């Protein structure tokens, strides 16, 4: 069923959270059992927000291996995402040394630092090129090169070095400033012109490690950017882009990391983006 048509069905109808409610009903439980270990707890930020035993990314270390991170794995797109929480305070370190050991060429960041008055995730990037972050735990280095500021969006190129080896690298951060504090946005149009900026980029493409996506849980405003970003890939690679069901694309993602879309709002979101997305491209 051609989903615009599924759309305006479901918005005559009111039914978006009936809808919601039978994905949550569906959705896949996995074990978590190395998140819930006390020895983590002060590497989680939601108790209620854990990444599965079998999907989760493992640190390349003896002492302890664990981030709250999932490698969401699309076999028939050809994508790879990694998501993961806003970085914390005892964290920021093994943060980026995830993304030098997984060869990620982007990170991409769907919310403030401070949102509706509290701190949503810690300020783990440098906000001038003289001043850099060495993080001691880890034995990383990161440099801010350049930042171009937009209405929508802004773009950071950064330095990460490994001071074990003194290999460099060039990571991209983009940056979505724009989600409000409450609800989602009135139209997609910016949310899509950001995505393809991080296309272009080159940062999703397969010479690179998985791009790392976040927010400050890793679920909603991270699930609804990989979710559009699939569903478009697969529009484009099938003969019949009608085929294409947001619901079930959904329920594949979550066999991967838990709770992906948080609102029935995100969910609606989801489908305008997609939407408007195609008709752009098709
Ligand atoms: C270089 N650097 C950055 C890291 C990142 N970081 C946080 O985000 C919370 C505090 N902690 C560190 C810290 C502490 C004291 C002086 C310098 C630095």
């Keep these: 069923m051609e989903m615009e048509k599924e759309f305006e ?7 978006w959270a009936a ?30 927000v854990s990444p599965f035993d079998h999907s989760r990314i493992k640190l390349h270390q003896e002492d302890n291996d664990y981030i709250n991170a999932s490698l969401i794995k699309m076999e028939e797109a050809q994508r790879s995402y990694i998501l993961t929480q806003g970085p914390l305070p005892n ?49 990383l280095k990161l440099t801010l090169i350049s930042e171009d500021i937009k209405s929508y969006y802004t773009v950071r190129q950064l330095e990460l070095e490994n001071l074990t080896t003194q290999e460099t690298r060039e990571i991209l951060h983009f940056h979505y400033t724009t989600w409000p504090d409450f609800g989602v946005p009135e139209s997609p149009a910016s949310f899509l012109n950001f995505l393809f900026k ?41 003969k019949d882009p009608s085929s294409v069901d947001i619901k079930k694309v959904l329920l594949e993602m979550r066999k991967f990391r838990m709770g992906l879309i948080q609102t029935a709002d995100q969910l609606r979101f989801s489908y305008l983006a997609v939407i ?7």
Aim: charged share 30%; proline share 4%; glycine share 8%.
């Design 91 to 139: 964290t920021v370190g093994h943060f980026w040394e995830m993304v030098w050991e997984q060869k990620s060429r982007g990170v991409v960041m769907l919310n403030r630092v401070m949102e509706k008055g509290s701190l949503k995730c810690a300020q783990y990037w440098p906000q001038k090129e003289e001043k850099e972050m060495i993080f001691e735990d880890t034995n």
């Design 9 to 15: 069905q479901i918005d005559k109808s009111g039914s």
């Design 19 to 48: 809808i919601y409610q039978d994905i949550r009903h569906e959705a896949s439980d996995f074990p978590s059992r190395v998140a819930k270990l006390p020895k983590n707890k002060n590497r989680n930020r939601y108790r209620d």
């Design 276 to 282: 408007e997305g195609a008709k752009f491209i098709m």
């Design 198 to 238: 991080v296309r272009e980029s080159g940062s999703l493409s397969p010479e690179h490690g998985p791009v790392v996506v976040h927010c400050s849980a890793g679920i909603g405003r991270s699930g609804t950017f990989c979710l559009a970003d699939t569903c478009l890939l697969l529009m484009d690679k099938r």
